[PDB]
Amino acid sequence: RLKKRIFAAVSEGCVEELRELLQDLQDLCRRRRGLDVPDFLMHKLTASDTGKTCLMKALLNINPNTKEIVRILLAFAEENDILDRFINAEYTEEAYEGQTALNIAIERRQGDIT
Amino acid sequence: LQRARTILEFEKMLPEWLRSRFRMGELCKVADEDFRLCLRINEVKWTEWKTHVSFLNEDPGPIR
């Protein structure tokens, strides 16, 4: 119920419901056993079937409010220190092997996000 | 126009259980609770560039 509401909020352009879900995501990190904070938080923001991440889902569905969703998502992944694995994630299945989040922003003709 | 008349004459002649086997198109979920049995045509366009909104599938490949 956490992973699906984040994908639904980013695609339609719900800015304010995104900040409430991301702050709840940090709350689950503290009150927990707390073993591996990079490998868990990367697993929640990634579909395990295809390897699609949240930043890939933002750029496929261009909203009028998508310039702020990229700004919040890149700000969020920095203090948790998984900036490297979040910006350089890839698909894993056979039909799309190697497509990155940079490779979608160029095709959707977004100059300033590039 | 002359060959199109010959095709529609052979289609009225064969029985019903052949006619369901030789049917074109497939059911496609177009909108909320709507199924319309569409036909698929591919094309390549070079001269007009735009950003793509209003599609059905995010994953552009052929499914399976």
Swiss-Prot record, chain A:
Q: Which domain of life is it from?
A: Eukaryota
- Any S-S bridges, and between which cysteines? none
Which compartments is it annotated to reside in?
Cell membrane; Cytoplasm; Lysosome
User: Where, by tissue, is this protein expressed?
Assistant: Expressed in keratinocytes and hair follicles.
Family, according to the entry, reads as follows: Belongs to the transient receptor (TC 1.A.4) family. TrpV subfamily. TRPV3 sub-subfamily.
Q: What this chain does, per the record?
A: Non-selective calcium permeant cation channel. It is activated by innocuous (warm) temperatures and shows an increased response at noxious temperatures greater than 39 degrees Celsius. Activation exhibits an outward rectification. The channel pore can dilate to provide permeability to larger cations. May associate with TRPV1 and may modulate its activity. Is a negative regulator of hair growth and cycling: TRPV3-coupled signaling suppresses keratinocyte proliferation in hair follicles and induces apoptosis and premature hair follicle regression (catagen).
Protein name, per record: Transient receptor potential cation channel subfamily V member 3
Name its species.
Mus musculus (Mouse)
**Gene name of the record:** Trpv3
